[PDB]
């Protein structure tokens, strides 16, 4: 089969599509192009041909095979934010990515994933006893900021554990994400005209400098440590690999940065959306509380509990299905292949529109929020909220642990109410790199009233 999509109007076809991505935002443009043309179609970002694909088969094929273990985006943009051939998230150098990923994978599983369940709970407890730092005079909690702070404290105490300014770093991380999102697919032209991107360059420097102070302190503690054997962690493993031949200071420094931003970027907005759903679905809220009563009671949550929390697990999955944050995935073809019907050349960019896929493929009631969608065991080839395979989410397992831990410890303690008739559907969302609340609007706050 030849490839669907707009006409290559002798050099205008590319300019409209890129411009449309810039104008609409990546996610809404993907959804536009998939709805107009097929669920498998072609478009251009800068020069290069990029396939925007919703079909479950193609998705599975792509994530399954090792010759798609790359992403893409502006080299100038990725250099600007420090992700050009450096971290793992947008590290598109195959070999350098291969050697860095294992550090992340170790830290996000085994004993650290077990530690995480109590670390995550104790952190939120701390922040729920200090709700004055986040609550209004009118009782309005800034949930986005609350979550970001506990997510950061969580990430810090597990992976780095150096004292830091939560509030400041959370703002800096937000700044870094805006820059990443802004520059990821900007054309080379953009990067010439300097007073159009110095803005972003500063956000990156703010965060990078802040983290350099922390890794600096972390370095000094490692040098003077007696029992280096016992107290290992993600940041230390990296630093010791650099002390062997294995890694570069620059790369270490970006990996530590990337581990600290991950959850604040994504967990916070996911749990935010999840809380607005609990607020407007009392049917489900009850089921979850009943489960928490049965399973946990008034004991501190423990690793053994999380597998038993079945209703919440379905809620989490249905929330990510219905209202995702990470609704699309960027990949690149490293070898030629046939994919469903169509040929895909080496170097061809790919955007997997997993948000659309979860409304077109397997589920009984795709366009409404119900746990009926997860009453029958969902095959993992029709529902990839995290992705899978050799480049799937490195946090995918621990993320689920973390989300259960915070939803338990919060709902245990508080009823959550939304302002006005607001719901996830009515919130004004930006749909660019990720899918998240437009924070220049308001009515995003919530109210926390106790239980008993
Ligand atoms: C609700 C939470 C989360 C969601 C929905 C999510 C989703 C995703 C998705 C879709 C990808 C792309 C994977 C692919 O291309 O197949 C990804 C990549 C990644 N995620 Fe997450 N994620 C979450 C939380 C986390 C957390 C908590 C961490 C770390 C602490 C993390 C670390 C990563 C990393 C490092 C990658 C890049 C993997 C690579 O390129 O090699 N994620 N995530
Ligand atoms: C999925 C994705 C890679 C992983 C990204 C995701 C954007 C949101 C995000 C923020 C983080 O800090 C961790 C990685 C993630 C979860 C990206 C959108 C396109 C890209 O392929």
UniProtKB/Swiss-Prot annotation:
It catalyses: testosterone + 3 reduced [NADPH--hemoprotein reductase] + 3 O2 = 17beta-estradiol + formate + 3 oxidized [NADPH--hemoprotein reductase] + 4 H2O + 4 H(+); androst-4-ene-3,17-dione + 3 reduced [NADPH--hemoprotein reductase] + 3 O2 = estrone + formate + 3 oxidized [NADPH--hemoprotein reductase] + 4 H2O + 4 H(+); androst-4-ene-3,17-dione + reduced [NADPH--hemoprotein reductase] + O2 = 19-hydroxyandrost-4-ene-3,17-dione + oxidized [NADPH--hemoprotein reductase] + H2O + H(+); 19-hydroxyandrost-4-ene-3,17-dione + reduced [NADPH--hemoprotein reductase] + O2 = 19-oxo-androst-4-ene-3,17-dione + oxidized [NADPH--hemoprotein reductase] + 2 H2O + H(+). CDD domains: CYP19A1 (cd20616). It is a multi-pass membrane protein. Its cofactor is heme. Substrate binds at residues 265, 330. It holds the Pfam family p450. One of its GO terms (cellular component) is endoplasmic reticulum. The keyword Methyltransferase does not apply. Its EC number is 1.14.14.14. Changing residue 321 to Q: In AROD; 0.4% of wild-type activity. InterPro entries: Cyt_P450 (IPR001128), Cyt_P450_CS (IPR017972), Cyt_P450_E_grp-I (IPR002401), Cyt_P450_sf (IPR036396), Cytochrome_P450_Monoox (IPR050196). Keywords: Disease variant, Endoplasmic reticulum, Heme, Iron, Lipid metabolism, Membrane, Metal-binding, Microsome, Monooxygenase, Oxidoreductase, Pseudohermaphroditism, Transmembrane, Transmembrane helix. The keyword Transmembrane applies. Phosphorylated in vitro by PKA and PKG/PRKG1. These phosphorylations inhibit the catalytic activity as measured by estrone synthesis from androstenedione (36% decrease for PKA and 30% for PKG/PRKG1). Heme binds at residue 393. Widely expressed, including in adult and fetal brain, placenta, skin fibroblasts, adipose tissue and gonads. Pathway: Steroid hormone biosynthesis. One of its GO terms (molecular function) is aromatase activity. Changing residue 270 to P: Found in deaf patients; uncertain significance. PROSITE patterns: CYTOCHROME_P450. One of its GO terms (biological process) is estrogen biosynthetic process. The chain crosses the membrane at residues 259-279. It is linked to Aromatase excess syndrome: An autosomal dominant disorder characterized by increased extraglandular aromatization of steroids that presents with heterosexual precocity in males and isosexual precocity in females. Aromatase deficiency: A rare disease in which fetal androgens are not converted into estrogens due to placental aromatase deficiency. Thus, pregnant women exhibit a hirsutism, which spontaneously resolves after post-partum. At birth, female babies present with pseudohermaphroditism due to virilization of extern genital organs. In adult females, manifestations include delay of puberty, breast hypoplasia and primary amenorrhoea with multicystic ovaries. A cytochrome P450 monooxygenase that catalyzes the conversion of C19 androgens, androst-4-ene-3,17-dione (androstenedione) and testosterone to the C18 estrogens, estrone and estradiol, respectively. Catalyzes three successive oxidations of C19 androgens: two conventional oxidations at C19 yielding 19-hydroxy and 19-oxo/19-aldehyde derivatives, followed by a third oxidative aromatization step that involves C1-beta hydrogen abstraction combined with cleavage of the C10-C19 bond to yield a phenolic A ring and formic acid. Belongs to the cytochrome P450 family. This is Aromatase.
């Amino acid at each position: 089969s030849s490839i669907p999509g707009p006409g290559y109007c002798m050099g205008i076809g590319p300019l409209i599509s890129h411009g449309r991505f810039l104008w609409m935002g990546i996610g809404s443009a993907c959804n536009y192009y998939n709805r107009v043309y097929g669920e498998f179609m072609r478009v251009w970002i800068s020069g290069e041909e990029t396939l925007i694909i919703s079909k479950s088969s193609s998705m599975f094929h792509i994530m399954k095979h090792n010759h798609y273990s790359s992403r893409f985006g502006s080299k100038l943009g990725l250099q600007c934010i420090g992700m050009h051939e450096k971290g793992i998230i947008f590290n598109n150098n195959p070999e350098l990515w291969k050697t860095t990923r294992p550090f992340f994978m170790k830290a996000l599983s085994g004993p650290g994933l077990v530690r995480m369940v109590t670390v995550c709970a104790e952190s939120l407890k701390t922040h729920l006893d200090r709700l004055e730092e986040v609550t209004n005079e009118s009782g309005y909690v800034d949930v986005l900021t609350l979550l970001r702070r506990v997510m950061l404290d969580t990430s810090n105490t597990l992976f780095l554990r150096i004292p830091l300014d939560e509030s400041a770093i959370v703002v800096k991380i937000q700044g870094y994400f805006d820059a990443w999102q802004a520059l990821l697919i900007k054309p080379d032209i953009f990067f010439k005209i300097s007073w159009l991107y110095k803005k972003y360059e500063k956000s990156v420097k703010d965060l990078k400098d802040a983290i350099e102070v922390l890794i600096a302190e972390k370095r000094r503690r490692i040098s003077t440590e007696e029992k280096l054997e016992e107290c290992m962690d993600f940041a230390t493993e990296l630093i010791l690999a650099e002390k062997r031949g294995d890694l570069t200071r620059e790369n270490v420094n970006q990996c530590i940065l990337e581990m600290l931003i991950a959850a604040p970027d994504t967990m916070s907005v996911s749990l935010f959306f999840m809380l607005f759903l609990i607020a407007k679905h009392p049917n489900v809220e009850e089921a979850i509380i009943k489960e928490i009563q049965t399973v946990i009671g008034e004991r501190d949550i423990k690793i053994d509990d999380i597998q038993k929390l079945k209703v919440m697990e379905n809620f989490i999955y249905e929330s990510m299905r219905y209202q995702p944050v990470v609704d699309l995935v960027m990949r690149k073809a490293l070898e030629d292949d046939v994919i469903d019907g169509y040929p895909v050349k080496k170097g061809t960019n790919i955007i997997l529109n997993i948000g659309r896929m979860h409304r077109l493929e397997f589920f009984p009631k795709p366009n409404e929020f119900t746990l009926e969608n997860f009453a029958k065991n969902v095959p993992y080839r029709y529902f990839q909220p995290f992705g899978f395979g050799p480049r799937g989410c490195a946090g995918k397992y621990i993320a689920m642990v973390m989300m259960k831990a915070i939803l338990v410890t919060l709902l245990r303690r508080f009823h959550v109410k939304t302002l006005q008739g607001q719901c996830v559907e009515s919130i004004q969302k930006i749909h660019d790199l990720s899918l998240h609340p437009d924070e220049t609007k308001n009515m995003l706050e919530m109210i926390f009233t106790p239980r008993n």
